[PDB]
């Protein structure tokens, strides 16, 4: 199995309402233009958890106290365990979104997701195609505003 194409934000928004506990990691490879997005994502009734550098962005924009920060691998290996509490202590996510991922990690975590954690769908929702989500956006990079569009859709039905 690779990763079904998405190829609206729609969808996207539509499964972060129906899930349980929807998470959103935000990696360091972020443009200008698409932090501006994660602010607003910031808003929404998801949970944020920020990794390595990123988590820099949320505190120059004083989002600090609004996100969760972890290192990649250690995160990971926290979702594959069925019984993790999560970050608030109430559970595990049903429903993960990666974007900003260092494209080799970010590829290697869903892999891991994929193959030792069924508890959980994961949706990567970058500029580049990850075959190993259960569902991915395309390779949008050459036109990132085509990108920015798929996100404000994402925010638009939140």
Known sequence: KMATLLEKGKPVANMI???????LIVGPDMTDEMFERVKKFVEKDITVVATGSAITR???????????????????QFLL???????????????VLMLGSIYYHGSQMLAAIKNFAPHIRALAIDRYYHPNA???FGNLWKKEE?????????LAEL
Not at 17 to 23: F, G, N
Not at 60 to 74: C, I, M, S, T
Not at 81 to 94: E, H, M, S, T, V
């Open 146 to 154: 085509d990108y920015l569009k798929l996100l404000d859709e994402i």
């Open 81 to 95: 365990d069925p019984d993790w509490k999560g970050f608030d202590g109430q559970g595990n996510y049903d429903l």
């Open 58 to 76: 949320f505190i120059d924009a004083g989002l600090g106290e609004k996100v969760n920060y972890a290192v990649l691998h250690e995160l990971t």
């Open 17 to 23: 309402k129906k899930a349980k506990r929807p998470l």
């Open 134 to 136: 259960d569902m991915s």
